[PDB]
Design a binder for this molecule. Structure first.
Ligand SMILES: [Ca+2]
Ligand SMILES: [Ca+2]
Ligand SMILES: [Ca+2]
Ligand SMILES: [Ca+2]
Ligand SMILES: [Ca+2]
Ligand SMILES: [Ca+2]
Ligand SMILES: [Ca+2]
Ligand SMILES: [Ca+2]
Ligand SMILES: [Ca+2]
Ligand SMILES: [Ca+2]
Ligand SMILES: [Ca+2]
Ligand SMILES: [Ca+2]
Ligand SMILES: [Ca+2]
Lengths: 331, 331, 331, 331, 331
């Protein structure tokens, strides 16, 4: 739905069940993790000269974001955007912090429909502050790769941490495409070799979903494009050439999606031709068994007049052959 | 209709019933409001060092605009545009004043048709001069948010006032889209599960209305794009990063509209396929009940010749099965 | 047709009936007007330090243009373009003169067809030299607005005179669009509620005419775009911000035309669906009155065998109801 | 076909019949012309301080081009491009010479098919070296305009000579368009008023040919665009403003072609609608003469039962009117 | 499939059968060749001041690439891209080495389906390091042109070697297009003159394959575009103007592909019209032989009533002519 105030703090999303603030402060050497539901127990991490990750799951608490935002020096309107989930993904560069809004998807296979949660990211000094609206994410491997010190996460700084969550979120889209490639694959057979009923409505659902998809990658692609040209906190030849290979991913997604929305585009045209081909066969059979049985039931019509038996049957049986011969141009 | 003079002051709109000049002069502390129908009782507000809002409802009085425009130093041709409602939304930057033309819509639900009133805005010093052609608007909350000193309107200057009316007008489009999303939603079912008559003409009305819509957002989007790059009176880091949030909105509108005009685009193609699928079933039934009843009425045709009863009925009843079996490739 | 010389002076147009040289020399204070058919009686106006308008109606006289062009210092090839009417509208900037080619249209309502005359304009010092191929134009109001000293025409210079003829020519297109909006309006009803014969050929005529139109606005739009960026003789803040409000017009035209060529584009698709809907009804009626009258004429077929009367009529009349009931899924 | 060496001199074209080297050396005062089939008798023209035109007709002699190219200092790979006719038109600028590749067409009217010969041009000092693969060209008027000293060809230099052959080649395309405008004109009637058989395959031939065309103007347009921005040997205000009026032509071609490939694009859609309109009439007639003659042959079916004459004929003749009346909604 | 680690070395391809490291070190004077399956026996070639070509066939050995990459100073993530075959072709420029990823195709004629192997190229000093996933390639002529010292390969440096493999790989695409031009050619006849069954599914396969194709040339075209603008190791006027004539090729491919995906695009529209033309003929025949034999079997229906012989046959035979005459508007 919509708002009508001047720039307040309303939450438009519809996930009012969960609230769980997780934090992962780490150095080149160490880390902890906890799940406090207290607001204040995370504010002292602003000055921690070591990479923190203050994940605030459950945005519906406008009051929680209001406090954290007033403390971290976050602008009043850039908080509103965190709460307003009906927004195109963007990157906002500021004097202190980099602000990113992203959306991650869930495709219900079978029940052809996709659902969208909006994740906000604020990068400031050594804090990648996060905002989810519901419990559960695709950021499970990244926190696990900090947990069992796997790879080059602990070794590197705090801005690199952002370019690890963003890899994890973009990587998820590769799953969605995989589900849809395998979707099309089937709902395409359903047009060649299954000309039934709700195959059409299943096809229109796909275009609908693909448009819905497209108009959330094409912007998310621009985020990593705009996150590439500029960047204040970057550590040039460390974190920049890294996400070149996430902005590379962000392209392949919105390139794959443009393939799907180009195959599915001309799929209903396959149907209409496949169907008009069937309504040729049926049409044809009707015209045959009415050019052998409509001429003959006319002969056997006159000879019911009230005013050689094998002379009429011979001349009927010969016409039913001057017919099935003439119908060798048509078969 | 059209004009043929050199740059005079003709009103092309067709709303000749209302005339009501409302003013809202306000400071950091106070305001008044009145509804004078006198022209002169608003001219002394040009020098009021406090944010005024001189709303002139009912443009049809060419004489009223002529006077106010001659007083405020407004160019002769930029007044003509205020009266000529058949014009693409634009922003005109000048030495003294910023000139903006906008259009706001009304979608008659049921009676599938949309109507357009054109609102002009002139920003000069501490005056946001307004021009409506009919009584009633979506600027009710903004004047109410000044009225009961809600939010940061009174606190800020006069150029910010403009970027509050413009938020209010752009926000209205979110209602129109909501009405059309919920429109498509229904007039799409009407193609999957209701293949009737005036469903087609209702679909063409939508494309017509969407084109009509599109070609008034895409320019209105450019207004807030061009109102972003430049700006003389702006108060940089106060009013500029505000309407970035509104030019952000202006995008999402013309992005949502591009979704609608991409779903509806390939909707008549759903119909034509759904219909050619029905004219397969009907076509098929005709070809069956004419390949069991046209062969048999031929047998019972010869035996009306004037020249075992269960031998003919057995051989007819067997053929009416060599048929309903052969029709298991087709069902 | 075509030429094959090196850059001579051939007239490709097909209007060989009229020749009438009109001139309107004017100052801040006075003017005259005459219709001499003599070539030489207009050449002394080259040095007249007061705005002249040397309209040469009837270009077919290659000799007339040859003389005037040799006198006014006009390049040999830029004269050829004046005579060669089969050319895209352009603006040519030179060391002395600005050269503009424009086309103005005539839409024969009813006889769905549009016709094109090409008007050339050369602006040099205080002379806007004109070239029409046939008598009669849309420049009647402009010469009348000089005649009865209406508006700011006499007051201003000679380059402004150009940006008054060009307003008058561009303004004409607003009439053409008005005729075509009202055309579509009707030839659209002719697809919803009149599925006849030459409705299709009338629709294809429109796309043809719209393409023909489009590819003469899109360049004419670029003329006033290119006439905006540069300009040697301009009188900056006098004549420049004037035609901004003609290049504004030039946009709205090629924006309106892009609406028409987007409604008409998907209009034949309305037809094909409306028609395939009719060939469903007809198709359906045929399948009904052949599943009540083909089964029953089979019963009344056996009982014509030569080898209770209300027992057969009751069982026929019951089947003709087990049918009209089963046909409540289909109505 | 294709090659597999490193940059040798293979001729891919299929015109192995002709070989005829023509030369036209000329000054401000005189010229000669000859048709030597000897290679060496043209090499001394490299230093002739007067405009030469060394036309080498019949490229299939790889050896001839190899020698001339080794003498004139032409790069090894830029010769390959002269022999390889399956290439997009381009302009190659070099330290000494300008290299241009062009294609000129032949449209077999009736036998709907177009054929392509590739002409190469090398401009060096006072030599416009030419390369044709077959005898005969559209360069007949240009050599004739040198021959009888017509126009400003002899008067001007050698780089201007190039911009005379190129005018002659581009001008040819105006003939092709003329043949296709007049083609469409007919093969469009063939869709409104001739719904036959191979009208469809004739329409697809046109799109095929238009795509084939388009993708040889759009590059040839870029040649004269790129031949406009730069140019080393140009003689600025002599030869440059000349071919501006050939790059102007090059536009109108690829603009006309974009009209054709926009009319023909939606022409098969005219057909499909015109045809589905006929398969309405036919469909309709079938449903009538089976709702007057299928109900009545049922009445006259019962009265053939073996178990007032104008009472049955009156009630049959009345139903055959309760029918032809009900069929006034449908006619 | 997909990965979930931080940037390790997983091989996504599915060709786990071959492993064969071939090397071709050469100077202006000599070369050797061998097929060692040992990893270490190729590492000393890093410093060989003479052009080496270290082809590593069979990427599935992650360990082999890991070692060679750690030795040659190759970044950890740019190795991952060598193993991850599901990636868009790109060129990566670095401080030491140029990194290129390319894909080469195999089109199974008949079994309408195309298969893709990914070839990686790393250019460093005098080493063009290669990475194939399966045995066999189109690089047979290039190694043969080194082998029997053909052309200018041995004569030139090591960066030129890259622009010989890349010519060989791009040249292969000319074969694919040749197979598809000849494919369309046939599967187009199959729409004009063969309106059968799986012609539709064969057409959709083509669009599918063409999209699949297009979205691997359009990037491969950009590789040679980006490999043209920049280049650190280039030897300017030696290796640069060479591959201009490969980036020229890279264009013609993605221009030819855009022709195919523009002919095939409107091919199903040929079918649907060709078919709706047949379902006119069939439809028509049915309506004839039911307007001569449905009226007459009505006459011979009344005269079976139980309540001049050549008077009825004359009046039936005359109506069967008032019919076949009326059907001269329809034939
Ligand atoms: Ca708001
Ligand atoms: Ca005007
Ligand atoms: Ca916002
Ligand atoms: Ca279509
Ligand atoms: Ca010419
Ligand atoms: Ca006349
Ligand atoms: Ca205006
Ligand atoms: Ca009978
Ligand atoms: Ca080659
Ligand atoms: Ca080449
Ligand atoms: Ca010209
Ligand atoms: Ca990853
Ligand atoms: Ca990568």
């Amino acid at each position: 739905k919509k708002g009508l105030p001047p720039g307040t703090l309303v939450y438009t999303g519809k996930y009012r069940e969960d609230f769980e603030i997780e934090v992962m402060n780490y150095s080149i050497e160490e880390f902890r993790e906890f799940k406090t539901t207290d607001v204040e127990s995370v504010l002292p991490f602003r000055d921690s000269s070591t990479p923190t990750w203050i994940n605030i799951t459950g945005i519906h608490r406008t009051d929680v974001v209001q406090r954290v935002g007033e403390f971290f020096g976050i602008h009043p309107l850039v908080l509103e955007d965190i709460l307003n989930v009906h927004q195109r993904p963007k990157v906002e560069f500021f004097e202190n912090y980099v602000f990113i809004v992203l959306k991650m998807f869930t495709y219900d296979k079978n029940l052809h429909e996709l659902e969208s949660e909006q994740v906000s990211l604020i990068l400031t000094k050594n804090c990648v502050l996060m905002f989810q609206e519901k419990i559960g994410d695709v950021f499970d491997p990244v926190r696990e790769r900090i947990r069992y010190n796997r790879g080059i996460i602990r070794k590197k700084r705090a801005d690199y941490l952002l370019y690890s969550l963003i890899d994890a979120l973009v990587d998820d889209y590769f799953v969605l495409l995989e589900k849809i490639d395998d979707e099309i694959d089937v709902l395409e057979e359903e047009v060649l070799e299954r000309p039934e009923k709700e195959t059409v409505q299943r096809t229109h659902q796909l275009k609908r979903n693909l448009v819905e998809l497209r108009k959330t990658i094409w912007p998310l692609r621009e985020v990593l494009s705009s996150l590439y040209r500029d960047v204040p906190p970057l550590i040039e030849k460390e974190t920049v050439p890294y996400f070149r290979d996430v902005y590379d991913h962000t392209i392949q997604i919105a390139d794959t999606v443009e393939t799907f929305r180009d195959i599915v585009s001309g799929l209903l045209d396959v149907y209409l031709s496949s169907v008009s081909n069937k309504t040729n066969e049926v049409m044809k059979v009707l015209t045959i068994i009415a050019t052998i049985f409509m001429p003959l039931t006319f002969i056997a019509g006159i000879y019911g007049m009230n005013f050689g038996y094998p002379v009429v049957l011979a001349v009927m049986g010969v016409i039913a052959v001057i017919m099935v011969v003439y119908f060798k141009k048509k078969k």
